Design a binder for this molecule. Sequence first.
Ligand SMILES: [Zn+2]
Ligand SMILES: [Zn+2]
Lengths: 21, 21, 21, 21, 21, 21, 30, 30, 30, 30, 30, 30
Amino acid sequence: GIVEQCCASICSLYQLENYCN
Amino acid sequence: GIVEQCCASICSLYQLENYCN
Amino acid sequence: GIVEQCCASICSLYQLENYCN
Amino acid sequence: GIVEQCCASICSLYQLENYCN
Amino acid sequence: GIVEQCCASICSLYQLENYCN
Amino acid sequence: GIVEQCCASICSLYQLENYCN
Amino acid sequence: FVNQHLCGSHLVEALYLVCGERGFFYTPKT
Amino acid sequence: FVNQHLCGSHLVEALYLVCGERGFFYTPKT
Amino acid sequence: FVNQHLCGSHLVEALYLVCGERGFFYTPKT
Amino acid sequence: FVNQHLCGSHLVEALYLVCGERGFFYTPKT
Amino acid sequence: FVNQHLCGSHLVEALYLVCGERGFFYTPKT
Amino acid sequence: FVNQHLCGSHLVEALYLVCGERGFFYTPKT
Ligand SMILES: [Zn+2]
Ligand SMILES: [Zn+2]
């Protein structure tokens, strides 16, 4: 999920926008 | 939702926990 | 500046990026 | 206290240091 | 104190409430 | 710069005030 | 007015501490 | 946008601003 | 009104930076 | 509630919300 | 009034995420 | 003032309050 994708590793804005609804 | 019940008046932790999963 | 355009109304990321270097 | 002197007007660091231990 | 109990180690809500006044 | 001086190492208030304008 | 945008950041920060691992959804739409 | 690890409340706040009136979901359990 | 609850979080955050190791007490009661 | 280490300003903010109008004390020196 | 001081902290926090390594200048003076 | 490492948004917020109406510059690229 988000912790693994964005905290453990880095997330581009497009990727962080996958968690918008 | 939460913006109209908790920005118009203060919401305690207990009132905030209602909006969790 | 930013205080009068973004505290008086909401500024999206895109509007905020205008004030970067 | 601090809520009535610093939320009604801006308090600098110096005014805030008065409420430390 | 609090740093040692809640930052070095983890604090339950009951324990964090020991630092309320 | 600031990251190197204030995050990698610690900055006194005088030093952090070097980055005020 | 007052500011529900600034309140919303505080709100989602508060919900991060209260919900913990249960997680949440923030929808200012109803 | 910023190019670094965003954890805990800094991830929730990055979500809050990126998503705008769409809102988001924060689900840390895995 | 205005919002002294949202202001209070900013206030205690500001006091964490200003007081450092002297610490503080936050009492909205007087 | 959240079940993780809370340090610096994240501890002060957790205190701020947990305690409510009671207020709290932040004393980091040990 | 409303509060542009509390809004300004949110503003510079938002700009830290949006600008990333381009950095910024915050001048409430114009 | 606090005597510890201040990184990311905690450095921007320390700057925000220290500098007051003077404003500041945040330039993380080196
Ligand atoms: Zn705020
Ligand atoms: Zn942090």
